[PDB]
Scaffold this active site. Structure first.
Site, short mmCIF file in Angstrom:
data_model
loop_
_atom_site.label_atom_id
_atom_site.label_comp_id
_atom_site.label_asym_id
_atom_site.label_seq_id
_atom_site.Cartn_x
_atom_site.Cartn_y
_atom_site.Cartn_z
N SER C 47 47.43 -58.17 -31.75
CA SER C 47 47.39 -59.33 -32.63
C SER C 47 47.75 -59.00 -34.08
O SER C 47 48.56 -59.70 -34.70
CB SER C 47 46.00 -59.96 -32.57
OG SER C 47 45.81 -60.65 -31.34
N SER C 48 47.17 -57.93 -34.61
CA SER C 48 47.38 -57.52 -36.01
C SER C 48 48.83 -57.14 -36.32
O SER C 48 49.22 -57.07 -37.48
CB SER C 48 46.45 -56.36 -36.35
OG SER C 48 45.11 -56.76 -36.15
N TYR C 136 42.13 -56.83 -22.92
CA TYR C 136 42.07 -57.19 -24.34
C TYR C 136 41.26 -58.47 -24.51
O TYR C 136 41.75 -59.57 -24.31
CB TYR C 136 43.48 -57.36 -24.92
CG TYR C 136 43.55 -57.72 -26.39
CD1 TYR C 136 42.45 -57.59 -27.23
CD2 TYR C 136 44.74 -58.21 -26.94
CE1 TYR C 136 42.52 -57.93 -28.57
CE2 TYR C 136 44.82 -58.56 -28.28
CZ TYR C 136 43.71 -58.42 -29.09
OH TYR C 136 43.78 -58.77 -30.42
N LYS C 164 39.48 -53.28 -24.56
CA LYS C 164 39.45 -53.38 -26.01
C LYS C 164 38.48 -54.50 -26.33
O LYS C 164 38.79 -55.67 -26.09
CB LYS C 164 40.83 -53.66 -26.61
CG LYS C 164 40.75 -53.82 -28.11
CD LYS C 164 42.09 -54.12 -28.76
CE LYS C 164 41.90 -54.34 -30.25
NZ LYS C 164 40.91 -55.42 -30.56
N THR C 166 36.90 -56.78 -28.59
CA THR C 166 37.14 -57.35 -29.91
C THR C 166 36.23 -58.52 -30.07
O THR C 166 36.69 -59.59 -30.44
CB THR C 166 38.60 -57.79 -30.04
OG1 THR C 166 39.45 -56.76 -29.54
CG2 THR C 166 38.99 -58.04 -31.46
N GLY C 188 36.66 -53.22 -31.24
CA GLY C 188 37.72 -53.89 -31.98
C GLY C 188 37.33 -54.48 -33.33
O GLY C 188 38.19 -54.84 -34.12
N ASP C 190 36.28 -53.75 -36.82
CA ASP C 190 36.26 -52.65 -37.78
C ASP C 190 34.96 -52.63 -38.58
O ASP C 190 34.44 -51.56 -38.90
CB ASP C 190 37.44 -52.76 -38.74
CG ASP C 190 38.79 -52.73 -38.02
OD1 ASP C 190 38.85 -52.98 -36.81
OD2 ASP C 190 39.80 -52.48 -38.69
N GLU C 191 34.44 -53.81 -38.88
CA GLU C 191 33.28 -53.95 -39.75
C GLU C 191 31.94 -53.71 -39.05
O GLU C 191 30.89 -53.87 -39.65
CB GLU C 191 33.27 -55.34 -40.40
CG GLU C 191 33.41 -56.50 -39.43
CD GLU C 191 34.85 -56.90 -39.19
OE1 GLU C 191 35.64 -56.07 -38.71
OE2 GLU C 191 35.21 -58.05 -39.51
N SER C 207 43.01 -52.59 -37.22
CA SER C 207 44.08 -52.81 -38.19
C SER C 207 43.78 -52.19 -39.56
O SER C 207 44.69 -51.74 -40.25
CB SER C 207 44.33 -54.31 -38.36
OG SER C 207 43.17 -54.94 -38.87
#
Lengths: 292, 292, 292, 292
Positions: C47-48, C136, C164, C166, C188, C190-191, C207
């Site tokens: 996606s990113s 995904y 994955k 997310t 997925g 990041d935070e 990303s």
């Protein structure tokens, strides 16, 4: 019993600074709805009455004052639904003794009740009060949805006579009207009255009919008589009013419109805030433009 | 007074067939929480105590009994939030009068209140009670989301000392933690204790800690000492339990787990239905597996 | 056969004003993630990478450039998922031919597909490609949610080696990790890398690791070594970065951080708009603060 | 130029076992819509055409075969919206050259584009094609919502002539009708055509008019003639059909109803599964009961 089709005001309530019911203003609001807005009846202690912010005593207060304020001919439905079933039963019995024509009860909310639990809540109130019951469906506030199959199970009860359908879907409403020809369906979205009318509802319950009840009558009548183009035009005008009050805070705004007529409309009950005066000029323009 | 960190039992309440509080069983549950589950305090009249099914005097009854039930080493937080702000104030005064260490209130719900209406709700309860306030945030029941910016406005008030964070997002939790390093954060999802712990929460309040509080303690302690894999295995175990009781109906199922210990856990308050005996064998299998 | 554990950049792609791929800059971005950020592999056409804005030939372009830009030690996952299954299979064969270690495919979206249809989509791509497959799941974009039981049915198939993940729910993540302890979980979000890591993921795809890969490695490694206080501090810092870039429009902004390094990081593909220069000052302050 | 008001079939597409278009069946399905169902036009390559499962060559194939299979008098609208704006403009160019009266474009989805990015997606397609544009608003599938304010912004454009309103809300429909009297509104919810008609739409586009076109026309005409009770009964009948096809998988089931007519209606495109023969008896009863 008494015929319950028709047009109802969702009765609004005036409060003082301490969140106490202003009984004198409440009487004026009841009389405005019937004698001025020329409505068929009152729907008492619904959401627009700020019901769920009240205590049991205040709700009884409201039922009393509204009952006494209108003539025998006027239709009265008592919203008695509560998260406290015992309270619901207590209120249901009270209104029934006061002479209300039907009870209504919001679907149990907050907790993720199963349908089985929501079902037996209606059944338990009916068994205790022995009055007729109108399902109060309002998914936008409750997050509770009732399917056709679940309505089937509910309407299988003889004393569950109808539904106050305050949900936006017209597919569902059409399905409900076809699946339940002989049950009462009162629509609860004022801004879709004309479409609800032609979808065959038996009436409507609304807070905006406290200030716009005569346009609502026209909309209802004209659409049934085929004069749908004129009904839609008046729906246009009524939606001007609805969209405007929605943007200002509907309950305080409607009550401020009522205040304009010389009614002691008082205040909202905290934590609702009083009418924000930043809207005053836009509001006065409205009242002027639509003669409210 | 006491500082509020630690692990809390969200206090479950036993009822009879008429929805009235079973004081004796209630006292027993309170003691299971402190003695058997080795917890630090009680969160009383929360959602898990079926609080929003209760009337005012019942809520006072639960506050009184709970406090009588525990010694003075035990921390006590009083959930007094309510759609009726006057009730919230009255309960807050009463709980403060009984010596509860802090107050907590769920975000006003049902109605689409503005944030400022929500804000001044907390501010009013604090002004009238002069006790500390913990924000009870539970979006999955209220539909109310609090943003970081809005928390900043709430936390600016000196007597809003922290939050019961019953929200699933760990980005928002991290943001809150960083932004308010000196405010109290107690997490509310039992099924994510290990993640909350490593996100720096000061403790947790949970309904499953009534039956699984020793595992919760080791999850919390071990996690803080970097023994993560052992903590996480315990989370694996705890979530087997949480999943199972969720699938069965959590409030009556937790109390049936307690009833297995000899506790008079009684019944749920209707419209909640009792434990479905059809789930019995699976419940028994769980109790023996994890030795509950 | 390459172990697919580890930390990956979700490869960003640089475009010119006509939305054509800039192969020169794309190579620079690829080598930046491997050489400068010291990441383990690339997730390509996710996606990113603005993949779902590209045509078939452009997707093949990206697959080509990325594989050629990295060493044989570098891991490579190829996202080939498409609403066009014929296209997904063609990209599947292309990527496998190039020697991508595994394929990955988003849950079919837009149409309300049944799980059966979704399931057989993954199985068909596997049939046609004879390559390993990573699920995904990105419910925030696709609106598609996979249950623990649906995962069982996917992980039953032998070439579905992982997911994955997310999605933000750490209860479901925990359940997946326990049910499928042999399967690959790459997180997925990041935070929440630190929560994901102590929840037992085998790696992460992000990303923002295109510009913050070094901190990402430290969070992952420190956490797995039980130094969670230091790990969480770095998550604070990282979430500063991630919050900021989110507030600015993440794809154009991440590529603007990259441009700062002297990479020809080009433009987003329309209808995405270029970086808004009202944000330049705040982006300079962030880059300076965390030395990006 | 052409007067685009009227009733359209949202053209269904027949595929073979490899996801390739059945050209012969496609001509038949087109000819069915116009000559047997007596509709005014075709809406080509919309969601119901399984368009978003197609490649660019296939969408062009469908535009050409549908154009040449029907008459000069037939109104043709080409849905050319796509996540690839370059593809959208290449298809818009292709469809304009073939003689399509208007273009139509879905709101960009999947990615959380800002409104400005959406707004200028339309402006760009228009600029490059110079043909008239119809906004395709279908929030149930895209997750994108367009405010009245946002609609006003789009309708400022002369070439943005109206909207295919595929959202259920009749407040917003009424507001758009009131605010843009000289814009074209075609409704996209077949099961709510009678309400849309009295709300003053200019026509409708639907997938089910491929098999129920004559009833659709009657509803439309009758409702506008004031004969709303008869129009509503036909809506009752129509929703029996719509509900049934929806319950069985609408694109496969609609084309099976066509196959009953002797049309080579082919298969749906994977990931769609063919019609489930478990539903055959129920479908046969529907076909016989409404003479389909």
């Amino acid at each position: 019993n008494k015929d319950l089709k028709g047009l109802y005001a969702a009765l609004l309530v005036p409060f003082d600074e301490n969140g106490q019911v202003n009984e004198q203003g409440l009487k004026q609001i009841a009389q405005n709805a019937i004698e001025t807005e020329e409505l068929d009846g009152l729907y008492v202690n619904g959401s627009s009455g700020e019901n769920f912010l009240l205590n049991t005593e205040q709700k009884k207060q409201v039922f009393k004052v509204a009952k006494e304020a209108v003539g025998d001919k006027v239709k009265l439905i008592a919203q008695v639904g509560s998260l406290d079933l015992n309270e619901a039963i207590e209120l249901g019995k009270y209104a029934t003794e006061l002479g209300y024509d039907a009870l209504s009860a919001v679907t149990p909310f907050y907790y993720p009740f199963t349908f089985e639990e929501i079902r037996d809540y209606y059944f338990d109130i009916i068994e205790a009060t022995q009055n007729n019951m109108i399902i109060y469906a309002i998914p936008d506030l409750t997050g509770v949805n009732i399917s056709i199959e679940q309505f089937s199970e509910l309407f299988n009860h003889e004393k569950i006579v109808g539904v106050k359908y305050t949900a936006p879907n017209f597919f569902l409403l059409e399905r409900i009207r076809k699946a339940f020809p002989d049950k009462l369906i009162l629509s609860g979205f004022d801004e879709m009255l004309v479409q609800a009318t032609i979808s065959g509802v038996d009436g409507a319950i609304g807070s905006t009919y406290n200030v716009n009840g005569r346009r609502a009558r026209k909309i209802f009548d004209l659409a049934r008589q085929g004069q749908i183009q004129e009904a839609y035009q008046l729906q246009h005008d009524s939606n001007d009013i609805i969209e405007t009050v929605l943007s200002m805070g509907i309950y305080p705004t409607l009550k401020e419109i009522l205040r304009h007529r010389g009614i002691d409309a008082g205040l909202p009950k905290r934590p609702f805030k009083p009418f924000n005066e930043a809207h005053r000029q836009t509001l006065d323009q409205l009242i002027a433009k639509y003669d409210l």
